[PDB]
């Protein structure tokens, strides 16, 4: 008999060391406790009480080792007796331990082949050779990843009766033979997973890939948490004309032929994803671009009340400019006070008639990008109020708000502007707008307490309080580019860019895997000029030659690499749904939810969900590696080969689930 709390104990020397272990647990939502061990030492928390174990797993980074000088040399800052308490806890309560960034020694059942890893720019490929100890992790065996920049130690298992190999360093320029990279130890009942390589989840995509092995193994696939990867790709500036960067003085506006190519390609890329996936492209519209196109001819202008909204744009304010409330000057023409354009006017745009066709509309996501794309950093309430309401009426008249995938309470702010203009945010709020999207290159717009949370505007910092700013990634597929030559040129001119378009896609592949394998649900920023494909020179992406747009080439690169590494689904959700999950994630993290599991004769038989007062506004996710006896009428989730996720709604009493097949320890 006995019970164990599902809290993960993370032991490290400083907050930087612990972050390479807590970031993964935080991404899953797994409750954890951080114990920092200075060189002077520290005492361990209460590991157990009577018949209840306080921790479901232990993670130790670099053996919390310091150089004590003298003949002592490098030693763990935890005493020998403290390490024995941890080993004793592992045995009595069946708790596993993970150690990464450790040197191969007798404590890990291995010895170093003798030497460091690889210097700067020296690659050594790494791959899992046996994933049978953590099958619900969904890692594809044999797929190679990069160790460049991560110091490691090629190792050799010394006694194969207590230590098995799960990862392997490939041969390279320094080494002629493969070697052991990670092991699992069984020391007379004590189970341990040891990684002979450093971790750096802040910059390394490889580290964010590896962490899913030790997290799944440490928890046996059973934990309070949730593993989902969202792939949301937003296309700004639809119906607008954008000035192209490389062939200066040229302009591009997406065409019907271009869009037919994108439509035909969506099922193609869907069939490349693992089972359970579901991808679509979400579009942000500017209604005034539809009126201006229809008014491009003399007779068309007569059909559109003379044309759309027209004004002179002011010079851009400094970034993060907070407009003093009540100031500014209106730019909108005084004559059109309300959206008053004819349906027949809008129909003169070939691109509109395509978008309004139900078969086309219902294959994409739709959200407002303001009517005229007016920058709102220094705009007035009156201007921004019409920027929102006009585009709402246009979306309603044209029928886009009837789409299967539509966002009604959120916008993509134009060029991410007005987020510090209180009068603008109030104009959003006075219409149905409650959330929006930000820019992850501007730290002011990101949550400073937890990356998994959205930022909430404040009266002090933004002139308005309550607007939810969801994060969004930027890419080297730039907003004013329509060809590979363009993006590569702007990447070269405005960055450390160097190489071809494949070189640009290669760095985008690594950076996006770091986001996706880190369970960052942020969307990605693209623009209408990036969809140009109908008339482009064919290029080759991963050996397949086609008339890919720069947007498609990015998605092809990202999706194929994701599928090469894991078998998880890729699920696209609307901006409205994405903002909802960001809010629910933030809210349930304030309830202090926890899990505990009961053990009966060396086997896990049940779990119990709890929170502060056993109540929470939001349901608590619980991941099952074995199906419980009954989901008890709660909302469940199990796409593709994912484990079963049960959203447990706590209402005052703690909920308990019985494992249909008990998990042996
Ligand atoms: C390799 O590890 C195994 C497992 O720890 C060792 O097997 C133990 O051997 C001792 C003495 O021979 C026995 O008292 C234990 O009962 C054994 N344990 C198990 C689980 O079988 C084995 O001796 C090790 N090999 C070497 C060469 O030391
Ligand atoms: C924000 O808007 C205000 C209001 O239009 C700007 O103030 C005007 O600035 C121009 C400079 O071109 C002056 O000629 C006007 O006299 C100013 N009017 C008032 C009422 O102050 C302000 O410059 C804008 N700031 C930014 C950064 O764009
Ligand atoms: C923790 O469990 C051990 C047995 O493994 C026991 O000896 C010890 O007293 C417990 N700690 C408590 C009750 O504080
Ligand atoms: C519980 O589930 C396992 C497989 O998930 C079975 O092997 C067992 O018999 C029980 O049905
Ligand atoms: Cl037609
Ligand atoms: Cl319809
Ligand atoms: Cl770069
Ligand atoms: Zn835009
Ligand atoms: Zn601008
Ligand atoms: Zn944009
Ligand atoms: Zn990025
Ligand atoms: Zn598969
Ligand atoms: Zn076991």
UniProtKB/TrEMBL annotation:
<feature type="binding site">
    <location>
        <position position="515"/>
    </location>
    <ligand>
        <name>Zn(2+) 5</name>
    </ligand>
</feature>
<feature type="binding site">
    <location>
        <position position="511"/>
    </location>
    <ligand>
        <name>Zn(2+) 5</name>
    </ligand>
</feature>
<protein>
    <submittedName>
        <fullName>Extracellular serine-rich protein, putative</fullName>
    </submittedName>
</protein>
<keyword id="KW-0862">Zinc</keyword>
<feature type="domain" description="Agd3 deacetylase">
    <location>
        <begin position="231"/>
        <end position="595"/>
    </location>
</feature>
<feature type="binding site">
    <location>
        <position position="527"/>
    </location>
    <ligand>
        <name>Zn(2+) 2</name>
    </ligand>
</feature>
<feature type="disulfide bond">
    <location>
        <begin position="304"/>
        <end position="345"/>
    </location>
</feature>
<feature type="glycosylation site" description="O-linked (Man...) threonine">
    <location>
        <position position="661"/>
    </location>
</feature>
<feature type="binding site">
    <location>
        <position position="236"/>
    </location>
    <ligand>
        <name>Zn(2+) 2</name>
    </ligand>
</feature>
<dbReference type="GO" id="GO:0046872">
    <property type="term" value="F:metal ion binding"/>
</dbReference>
<feature type="binding site">
    <location>
        <position position="373"/>
    </location>
    <ligand>
        <name>Zn(2+) 3</name>
    </ligand>
</feature>
<feature type="disulfide bond">
    <location>
        <begin position="591"/>
        <end position="616"/>
    </location>
</feature>
<feature type="binding site">
    <location>
        <position position="237"/>
    </location>
    <ligand>
        <name>Zn(2+) 3</name>
    </ligand>
</feature>
<feature type="disulfide bond">
    <location>
        <begin position="481"/>
        <end position="486"/>
    </location>
</feature>
<keyword id="KW-0479">Metal-binding</keyword>
<feature type="binding site">
    <location>
        <position position="375"/>
    </location>
    <ligand>
        <name>Zn(2+) 4</name>
    </ligand>
</feature>
<feature type="domain" description="Agd3 C-terminal">
    <location>
        <begin position="597"/>
        <end position="663"/>
    </location>
</feature>
<feature type="binding site">
    <location>
        <position position="316"/>
    </location>
    <ligand>
        <name>Zn(2+) 4</name>
    </ligand>
</feature>
<feature type="binding site">
    <location>
        <position position="665"/>
    </location>
    <ligand>
        <name>Zn(2+) 1</name>
    </ligand>
</feature>
<feature type="binding site">
    <location>
        <position position="369"/>
    </location>
    <ligand>
        <name>Zn(2+) 3</name>
    </ligand>
</feature>
<feature type="domain" description="Agd3 CBM87">
    <location>
        <begin position="4"/>
        <end position="217"/>
    </location>
</feature>
<feature type="glycosylation site" description="N-linked (GlcNAc...) asparagine">
    <location>
        <position position="48"/>
    </location>
</feature>
<feature type="binding site">
    <location>
        <position position="191"/>
    </location>
    <ligand>
        <name>Zn(2+) 1</name>
    </ligand>
</feature>
